[PDB]
Paper text:
[name] ([name]) catalyses the hydrolysis reaction of inorganic pyrophosphate (PPi) to two inorganic phosphates (Pi) and plays an essential role for living organisms. We previously reported the expression and purification of family II [name] from the psychrophilic [name] Sh-[name] activated by Mn2+ ions (Mn-Sh-[name]) displayed the highest activity at 5 °C, which is characteristic of cold-adapted enzymes.
In the crystal structure of Mg-Sh-[name] with [name], the bridged water between Mg2+ ions at M1 and M2 is assumed to be replaced by a fluoride ion. An anomalous difference Fourier map indicated that M1 and M2 metal sites in the crystal structure of Mg-Sh-[name] contain a small fraction of metals other than Mg2+. Based on the anomalous scattering factor of these elements (f ″ = 0.24 for S; f ″ = 1.6 for Fe) at an X-ray wavelength of 1.0 Å, M1 and M2 were occupied by Fe with an estimated content of 15% and 7%, respectively. The overall structure consisted of N- and C-terminal domains, and the overall conformation was changed from the ‘open’ to ‘closed’ state by the binding of substrate, as occurs with other family II PPases.
Residue numbers in the entry: 2 to 307
Write the structure that this text describes.
Amino acid sequence: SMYVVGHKIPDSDSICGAIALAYLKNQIGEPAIAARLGELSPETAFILEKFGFEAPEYKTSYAGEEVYIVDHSEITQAPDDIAQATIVGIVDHHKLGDLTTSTPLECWIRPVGCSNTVIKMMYDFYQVKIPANIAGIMMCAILSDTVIFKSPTCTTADIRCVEALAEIAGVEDFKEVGMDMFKVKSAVEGTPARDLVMRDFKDFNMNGNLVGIGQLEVIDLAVFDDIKADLEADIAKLKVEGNRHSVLLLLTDIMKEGSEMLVVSDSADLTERAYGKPTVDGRVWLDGVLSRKKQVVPALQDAFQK
Ligand SMILES: [Ca+2]
Ligand SMILES: [F-]
Ligand SMILES: [Mg+2]
Ligand SMILES: [Mg+2]
Ligand SMILES: [Mg+2]
Ligand SMILES: [Mg+2]
Ligand SMILES: [Mg+2]
């Protein structure tokens, strides 16, 4: 079987998309196994419990295997031994990263709100029925990635996909399922700083500079008031531990629709140069910023390339 696997530090799109695409591949006679590179977030556990799924197989070494990548195209987010695997496919909605192959492959990459929107397009292409349970987790993944349609990554395709999947899944009030997921994400009391920094964290190679970016999407920024200094101390430790150029942590309020970014960087003017918004003692408020892939990464990557 091929293994279908999303990014390191998987989120709901990576987990649910691996399950949904493995099902589709098996239905079309292409043996597949869904896998994961890490533990589930509370949000993803909530989604899988709601629709009756077990977590996919936890698997970290893929040398000699065929792999269908979900929800990224980056060396830093792939299995460590992906160069000794064969990538047979990528389904994604990110920038084109530094993965490569030696062989022809499939890529279903679209600049939409969720990888699961593209996986639904694959089900449509093959004319395979989406079971109710699979539809539910796909629906949840799109509601999560699009921030209940608030994110600027959201497209008409994502909305139409949620509407179609919600009908299949038997969900009438899908926006309340969306809000439920963000209430789960907001339940951060008593969680160690490092577990919050790493909950939704990605490394990026930006012109040979290693940049770590975490994100914590919540309903109310004030949940971070007491732990903010602990988060700041922790990102400085994480910077050193991984010999990173920069570590950024987005504290994202989905109701204000903006983010406070905590910054530790070898570049004193990083956010001034990237966004035209200077940090002050390592913090900057980024009005309107919800999306890492659309509103955070591009300007940073371009600033490192220049
Ligand atoms: Ca490439
Ligand atoms: F995702
Ligand atoms: Mg993801
Ligand atoms: Mg995604
Ligand atoms: Mg996501
Ligand atoms: Mg995300
Ligand atoms: Mg969570």
